[PDB]
């Protein structure tokens, strides 16, 4: 296939120079569990038990007992396939674009396949890392013009029915309100049996300047980081706490668990690009390829993820 | 107005030659506006120049974003156009 | 909209970890205390008379009696549970005392409740106690624990 | 079935896209390894 | 629903060859070219088969099709997929010629899009080429040939 196909050639060679994504921080290496799906849901069910009323006491003859009731619950997994389209040289109208130092045209704006599938690949990872975090898809700095997404496809920032925390325009600046929000954020988690367990924080860049002062009169060998540390630590049965800066996010606060068994990733195998084998071409030097992702596959329990919000408004 | 014939989405200057999409193909990408009053949801026409402009027009242009700037009088703006109207 | 079982799937495993106010759902079919000596009929079901009183309905005479949600003079039992598979529904007699959770009226314990025309407890013939206060599940659903005795003036 | 394995002659596209996946998978495996915290 | 999702009850008799084509389930065009430009877009409510026109939202999320016509049409939805809510969409720039919902009609008619995406006899924009089939009480679907817009 080699010898016949140069663009397969072309990828298998160049596919190493391709960065590994910095979503793979955020996960502890039990907790991605890779799937086989391209387009589709996965569903599972979850068996749940509650007591209807008050015991009955077992005195003299009685007929008449208190029941214990069951439920379930079927959790559903959506994944979506998604394509981008880029244009690149052919492979015979290289040599006539081969400078000495650079290849492509400058003025046209035209790269050799390997070079426009490797930066068009860093792209594509770039904004899956992005839906991961933040759970949308969008390409503008405002945000707006969201792509619509399939229901049952979350990110780590829009997952619902989880602790939400919304710090006032008044006391942007103020630490101390900032980590009076954390304290009550963290007071309503629900870890249960899991509580011994590492724990996770991701802040953006501004937050992470505010940590390093001192802890307020200022205290001395005392910082808001260790402070913050000392209290994610009661909770967690004193287990390891990992701090990461993304400047995806802005103004928030990430907080959730390193546990398999409260939140799991279970993306496609297909999840990170791959070439297509259709390559549009013409009598022209110019062709067309295209690339193929799968997005979604994240799976959180309830009230298991901290989301603190500060309102710059 | 109602010259119009297509619109020019790429030019090489080395042989003076500009590639066109004709009317009759619908189009979707950035072209440039006369100014900065164009929201989205705003029916468009093609002026004198060439440029879009907010609104009697014979083709349907409608804006998808709002202009945005980049030298003294550049202003793209994201629009779709479908043909003509009736 | 009203089935027992929610059609719309959950996004989320749900957290089992408290014990308290977790019966208190659609989903919670029959009754809160149940005997090995009751007596329960099922019957074709005509509409979803699930956790509503219910009366005898006749056809034609091609096809057999059915029950639909009703009250009033015509009651006849309450359904405490339905299979949609078959279309069967689980009916207790009127003879036969319930306790358990029924549809209420869009209340007090102590409070006494009949039957309305659509098979939703009312306050006030007296059919039933109301053991608790209404509980909202949807904006128009109302559910009421409430013990059943029968009829009497 | 991995592009990292040279022995590895891909007999078409279909066993091409699988060891791309494969080579993924390797390359994640390799780097919590790596991974200290 | 394109897909008619009541089971049936019996096996098909796969014998005959005539009048197999008259059903709701049929999608895409009579006549297809392998040049047609095709475009999906975000699914609001059912549009499968009529008329549709591109609405915006307040900006949170980007555009969808809708079924419209008028003087806001955009195109014609031949296809839809359920899954992902995503509409097939021709545009109107390109022509077509296929079964199309049809207002509850003969042959040589000109037929516009209504507010509801369905042709009603009449800016013509395409022409009957059979006459109203009926499939529903309230369905009826005709074999149409769309040429854009024009006076």
């Given at each position: 296939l080699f010898d016949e196909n140069y663009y397969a050639k072309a990828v298998a060679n160049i596919i190493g120079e391709v960065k590994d994504p910095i979503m793979y921080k955020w996960f502890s290496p039990d907790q991605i569990e890779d799937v086989d799906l391209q387009m589709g849901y996965q569903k599972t069910v979850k068996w749940d038990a509650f007591l209807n009323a008050n015991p009955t006491t077992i005195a003299n003859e009685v007929n008449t007992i208190s029941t214990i009731g069951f439920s379930s619950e079927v959790v559903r997994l959506n994944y979506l396939k998604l394509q981008y389209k880029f244009r690149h040289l052919k492979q015979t109208s290289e040599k006539f674009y081969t400078s000495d130092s650079y290849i492509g045209d400058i003025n046209n704006?035209?790269?050799?396949?390997?070079?426009?599938?490797?930066?068009?690949?860093?792209?594509?990872?770039?904004?899956?890392?992005?839906?991961?975090?933040?759970?949308?898809?969008?390409?503008?700095?405002?945000?707006?013009?969201?792509?619509?997404?399939?229901?049952?496809?979350?990110?780590?920032?829009?997952?619902?029915?989880?602790?939400?925390?919304?710090?006032?325009?008044?006391?942007?600046?103020?630490?101390?309100?900032?980590?009076?929000?954390?304290?009550?954020?963290?007071?309503?988690?629900?870890?249960?049996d899991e509580f011994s367990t590492p724990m996770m924080v991701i802040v953006d860049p501004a937050t992470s300047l505010k940590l390093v002062k001192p802890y307020a009169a200022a205290s001395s060998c005392e910082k808001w980081e260790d402070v913050l540390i000392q209290t994610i630590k009661a909770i967690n049965n004193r287990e390891d706490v990992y701090i990461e800066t993304s400047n995806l996010l802005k103004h928030k606060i990430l907080i959730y668990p390193l546990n398999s068994e409260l939140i799991k990733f279970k993306p496609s195998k297909y999840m990170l690009p791959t070439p297509n084998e259709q390559v549009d071409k013409d009598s022209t030097d110019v062709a067309h390829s295209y690339i193929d992702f799968v997005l979604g596959g994240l799976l959180a329990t309830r009230k298991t993820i901290l989301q603190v919000n500060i309102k710059q408004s | 107005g109602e010259d119009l014939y297509g619109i020019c989405i790429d030019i090489d200057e080395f042989s003076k030659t500009a590639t066109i999409v004709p009317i009759t193909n619908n189009f979707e990408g950035y072209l440039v506006a006369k100014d900065s009053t164009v929201k989205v949801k705003d029916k468009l026409i093609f002026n004198k120049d060439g440029a879009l402009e907010k609104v009697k027009a014979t083709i349907n242009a409608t804006a998808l974003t709002d202009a945005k700037q980049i030298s003294n009088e550049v202003y793209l703006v994201k629009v779709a156009v479908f043909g003509n109207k009736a | 909209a009203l089935m027992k079982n929610p059609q719309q799937d959950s996004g989320l495993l749900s957290n089992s970890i408290d014990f308290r106010d977790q019966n208190l759902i659609?989903?919670?079919?029959?009754?809160?205390?149940?005997?090995?000596?009751?007596?329960?009929?099922?019957?074709?079901?005509?509409?979803?008379?699930?956790?509503?009183?219910?009366?005898?309905?006749?056809?034609d005479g091609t096809t057999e009696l059915e029950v639909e949600a009703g009250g009033g003079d015509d009651l006849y039992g309450v359904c405490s549970d339905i299979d949609e598979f078959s279309g069967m529904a689980t009916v207790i007699p009127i003879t036969n005392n319930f306790t358990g959770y029924l549809?209420?009226?869009?209340?007090?314990?102590?409070?006494?409740?009949?039957?309305?025309?659509?098979?939703?407890?009312?306050?006030?013939?007296?059919?039933?106690?109301?053991?608790?206060?209404?509980?909202?599940?949807?904006?128009?659903?109302?559910?009421?624990?409430?013990?059943?005795?029968g009829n009497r003036a | 079935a991995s592009l990292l394995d040279s022995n590895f002659v891909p007999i078409n596209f279909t066993e091409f896209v699988q060891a791309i996946s494969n080579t993924y998978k390797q390359r994640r495996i390799q780097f919590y390894e790596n991974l200290k915290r």
């Amino acid at each position: 296939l080699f010898d016949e196909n140069y663009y397969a050639k072309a990828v298998a060679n160049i596919i190493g120079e391709v960065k590994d994504p910095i979503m793979y921080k955020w996960f502890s290496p039990d907790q991605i569990e890779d799937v086989d799906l391209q387009m589709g849901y996965q569903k599972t069910v979850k068996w749940d038990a509650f007591l209807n009323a008050n015991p009955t006491t077992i005195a003299n003859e009685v007929n008449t007992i208190s029941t214990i009731g069951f439920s379930s619950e079927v959790v559903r997994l959506n994944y979506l396939k998604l394509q981008y389209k880029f244009r690149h040289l052919k492979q015979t109208s290289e040599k006539f674009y081969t400078s000495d130092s650079y290849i492509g045209d400058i003025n046209n704006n035209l790269l050799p396949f390997a070079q426009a599938y490797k930066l068009a690949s860093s792209e594509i990872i770039k904004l899956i890392n992005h839906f991961v975090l933040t759970g949308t898809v969008s390409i503008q700095k405002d945000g707006k013009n969201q792509k619509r997404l399939l229901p049952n496809m979350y990110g780590l920032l829009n997952m619902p029915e989880q602790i939400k925390e919304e710090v006032a325009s008044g006391d942007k600046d103020k630490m101390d309100k900032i980590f009076e929000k954390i304290e009550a954020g963290l007071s309503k988690l629900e870890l249960g049996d899991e509580f011994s367990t590492p724990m996770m924080v991701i802040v953006d860049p501004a937050t992470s300047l505010k940590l390093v002062k001192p802890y307020a009169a200022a205290s001395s060998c005392e910082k808001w980081e260790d402070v913050l540390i000392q209290t994610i630590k009661a909770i967690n049965n004193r287990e390891d706490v990992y701090i990461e800066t993304s400047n995806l996010l802005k103004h928030k606060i990430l907080i959730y668990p390193l546990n398999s068994e409260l939140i799991k990733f279970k993306p496609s195998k297909y999840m990170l690009p791959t070439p297509n084998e259709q390559v549009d071409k013409d009598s022209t030097d110019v062709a067309h390829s295209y690339i193929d992702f799968v997005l979604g596959g994240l799976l959180a329990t309830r009230k298991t993820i901290l989301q603190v919000n500060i309102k710059q408004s | 107005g109602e010259d119009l014939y297509g619109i020019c989405i790429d030019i090489d200057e080395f042989s003076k030659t500009a590639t066109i999409v004709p009317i009759t193909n619908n189009f979707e990408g950035y072209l440039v506006a006369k100014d900065s009053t164009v929201k989205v949801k705003d029916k468009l026409i093609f002026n004198k120049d060439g440029a879009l402009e907010k609104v009697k027009a014979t083709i349907n242009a409608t804006a998808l974003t709002d202009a945005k700037q980049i030298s003294n009088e550049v202003y793209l703006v994201k629009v779709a156009v479908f043909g003509n109207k009736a | 909209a009203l089935m027992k079982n929610p059609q719309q799937d959950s996004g989320l495993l749900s957290n089992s970890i408290d014990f308290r106010d977790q019966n208190l759902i659609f989903s919670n079919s029959g009754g809160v205390c149940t005997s090995s000596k009751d007596k329960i009929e099922n019957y074709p079901a005509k509409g979803y008379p699930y956790k509503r009183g219910v009366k005898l309905s006749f056809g034609d005479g091609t096809t057999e009696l059915e029950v639909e949600a009703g009250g009033g003079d015509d009651l006849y039992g309450v359904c405490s549970d339905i299979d949609e598979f078959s279309g069967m529904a689980t009916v207790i007699p009127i003879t036969n005392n319930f306790t358990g959770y029924l549809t209420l009226k869009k209340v007090n314990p102590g409070d006494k409740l009949n039957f309305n025309q659509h098979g939703e407890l009312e306050k006030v013939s007296v059919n039933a106690i109301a053991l608790s206060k209404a509980h909202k599940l949807t904006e128009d659903l109302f559910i009421v624990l409430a013990s059943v005795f029968g009829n009497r003036a | 079935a991995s592009l990292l394995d040279s022995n590895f002659v891909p007999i078409n596209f279909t066993e091409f896209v699988q060891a791309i996946s494969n080579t993924y998978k390797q390359r994640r495996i390799q780097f919590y390894e790596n991974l200290k915290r």
